[PDB]
């Protein structure tokens, strides 16, 4: 009985509210239409036409003159930053554990930036990366293209002339692997396609020749992929076909000289360096 009473009361009250809203909308449409269509004669013949504002105009002049930006929009709290950095390191280690359980066409950087060998080249590449990120209006395509020619620059630079002495190529390759790992840690979308290009090139070359064109860039490719990625996880399209292809090199092609056995030995110790963390 209480259900029927409150139910009929609420239903009739909602219907009364809907009827009142419909009557108000009908009166709105009626008065507005029959007045806007009738006022076409009197919507033409009805005619009837300090220091704070001055200094506000001066302040707007100063505001359009001087313009700047805030640095990082937050606080650099040491304890909160250390807790988030510890949680980020734990997130990286736990992600590695959970995934281990689960117009630059190959000659642009040498044509433009590579002055002598390495020194002016990486600095001019930094100049290109600073000029492109400055005037990056809409930039995905050209960014991918000149990062591609950066990886091109190293894959036809790091093989011919390491003949200049030890500490020189040591410090230039150290600065290069540091800046390239720290730059390509946040992304994968072009290094992945360059790794597809490189596994295509080394597999095709290894089918093509016996040994006399096995380039010195394979060791640098294995070094840069081992630096830019932690090889601990299993399901990874990038690191594993190169490792089965170096195992294919070792099982198939012949090593009849001391530099060839040394090539096999440095590939064995770099797969040992991979399984140091794998």
């Amino acid at each position: 009985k209480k259900t029927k009473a409150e139910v009929m009361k609420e239903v009739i009250a909602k219907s009364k509210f809907y009827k009142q809203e419909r009557q108000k909308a009908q009166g709105i449409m009626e008065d507005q239409i029959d007045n806007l269509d009738d006022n076409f004669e009197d919507v033409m013949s009805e005619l009837m036409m300090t220091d704070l504002d001055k200094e506000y105009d001066i302040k707007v002049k100063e505001l359009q003159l001087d313009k700047r930006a805030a640095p990082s929009d937050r606080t650099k709290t040491e304890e909160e930053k250390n807790a988030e950095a510890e949680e980020k390191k734990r997130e990286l280690e736990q992600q590695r554990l959970d995934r281990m359980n689960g117009r630059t066409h190959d000659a642009l950087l040498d044509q433009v930036k590579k002055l002598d060998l390495d020194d002016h080249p990486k600095i001019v590449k930094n100049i290109i990366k600073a000029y492109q990120p400055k005037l990056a209006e809409g930039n995905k395509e050209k960014l991918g293209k000149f990062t591609a020619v950066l990886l091109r620059h190293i894959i036809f630079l790091s093989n011919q002339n390491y003949l200049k002495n030890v500490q020189s190529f040591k410090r230039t390759q150290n600065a290069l692997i540091s800046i390239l790992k720290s730059l390509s840690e946040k992304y994968n979308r072009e290094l992945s396609e360059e790794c597809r290009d490189y596994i295509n090139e080394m597999q095709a070359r290894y089918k093509k020749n016996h040994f006399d064109a096995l380039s010195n860039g394979d060791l640098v490719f294995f070094s840069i992929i081992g630096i830019l990625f932690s090889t601990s996880d299993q399901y990874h399209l990038v690191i594993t076909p190169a490792l089965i292809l170096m195992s294919q090199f070792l099982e198939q092609i012949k090593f009849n000289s001391l530099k060839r056995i040394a090539f096999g030995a440095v590939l064995v110790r770099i797969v040992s360096q991979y399984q140091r963390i794998s």
Partner: protein, 251 residues
């Protein structure tokens, strides 16, 4: 005059719910006669959709001349009556969207609405609500500095300066207009106010929230009077992170 049915049109606009503006009131802003429209319309008809069309209406027709014609007529008086009748102390939805949509032409909005809101006895809570409502949306930097220059050359009073406290909880950028507005606000509050004007720890929290990262690329005079701040007005909650950031800061 107008078509004379406007007491009836106001009686409908009292309590009709869903729709938009009439074509009569839509053709009068191309005309010049909305004075004699509203003087017979008798503005008590405050329904939420007509408040929405009202705020888009007068900020569409807000330039300097017509802004100083009708910028202080019925609007914040209706806000005074609605907030004095409200007991929950909350922004209404039409209130929120009214001021948040009224910002959408800041060419004279910042001189016509932000300036007369202390017209007859404004409150610290009112400055807090107004700061939050016009704080939650993106403002242009030049227009916000155009409001802030006159707002900060106003004196030291809580329903004027907790609005500036929320204006720095907005965590602005730092142009040199923000720098020199900061130096004359600093000279606005220092040690005849030394005997009669006191300053509590909520304004110490305001000091924290602009001294948080308002020291990006600024000069040595700022360091001079902020070391004057740490000698004069050092509370317990002002020390560690702020002195760490003063040591980390540079020119």
């Amino acid at each position: 005059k107008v078509i004379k049915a406007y007491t009836t049109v106001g009686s409908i606009l009292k309590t009709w719910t869903h729709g938009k503006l009439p074509k009569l009131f839509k053709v009068i802003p191309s005309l010049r006669n909305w004075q004699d429209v509203i003087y017979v319309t008798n503005p008590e008809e405050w329904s939420p959709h007509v408040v929405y069309e009202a705020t888009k209406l007068f900020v569409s027709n807000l330039t300097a001349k017509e802004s100083q014609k009708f910028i202080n007529l019925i609007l914040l008086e209706r806000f005074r009556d609605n907030i004095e009748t409200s007991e929950d102390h909350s922004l209404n939805y039409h209130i929120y969207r009214a001021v948040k949509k009224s910002l959408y032409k800041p060419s004279a909005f910042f001189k016509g609405f932000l300036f007369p809101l202390v017209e007859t006895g404004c409150n610290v809570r009112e400055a807090t609500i107004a700061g939050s409502v016009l704080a939650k949306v993106s403002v242009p930097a030049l227009h916000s500095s155009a409001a802030l220059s006159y707002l900060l050359r106003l004196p030291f009073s809580p329903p004027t300066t907790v609005f500036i406290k929320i204006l720095l909880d907005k965590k602005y950028a730092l142009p040199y207009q923000t720098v020199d507005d900061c130096v004359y606000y600093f000279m606005r509050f220092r040690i005849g106010e030394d005997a009669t004007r006191v300053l509590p720890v909520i304004w110490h929290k305001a000091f924290l929230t602009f001294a948080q990262r308002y020291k990006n690329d600024i000069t040595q005079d700022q360091r001079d009077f902020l070391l004057e701040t740490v000698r004069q007005r050092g509370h317990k909650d002002i020390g560690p992170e702020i002195r760490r950031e003063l040591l980390a800061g540079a020119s």
